Symmetry: C2
Subunit: 100 residues, 2 copies
């Protein structure tokens, strides 16, 4: 089991309603993309690193790093990326297996 983590900042012109619609859409992909096992998102409330600007976190769960590729190329995901391409300003991506 691997987590695909995204840390993101939206463009300034994007409204809160748009952001919530964006995340709803992303969460709803789980239903239609077999490789996606789970999605959670959240807004940062502490703002400990404002100079960096990142505001939101998204966690997508996969059975393996391998199967992330099946999600990346799935038509529903490609379409999601196309539709919302104007929304994001910058992001960090991480893939890891959570452990103790």
């Amino acid at each position: 089991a691997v987590k695909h983590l995204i840390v993101l900042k939206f463009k300034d012109e994007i409204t809160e309603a748009q952001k919530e619609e964006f995340f709803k859409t992303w969460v709803n992909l789980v239903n239609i993309i077999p490789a996606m096992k789970d999605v959670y998102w959240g807004k940062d409330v502490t703002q400990k690193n404002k100079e960096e600007g990142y505001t939101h976190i998204v966690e997508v769960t996969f059975e393996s790093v391998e199967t992330i590729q099946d999600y990346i190329i799935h038509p529903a995901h490609v379409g999601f990326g196309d539709v919302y391409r104007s929304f994001w300003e910058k992001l960090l991506i991480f893939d890891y297996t959570p452990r103790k």
Copy 2:
């Protein structure tokens, strides 16, 4: 329910064994700090940004109790011994939702 997320890069001289001992020590705080409910960590394998190499997720009951962890004597000691290990970090606190 809130997640206290740390994105971290270590100093270059820090060895892999040192990193694993660092995370072992951090994980073992859960037992000792009432506010800490759970911890996981992991190494990024994709390395697509460039930068940050490790992720730590600490689980809390609320944003308010994160402070109880921050000032807990076990956590203060942990920071005193190991803060020199890291080069830079990003911190995020959020309620994971659908």
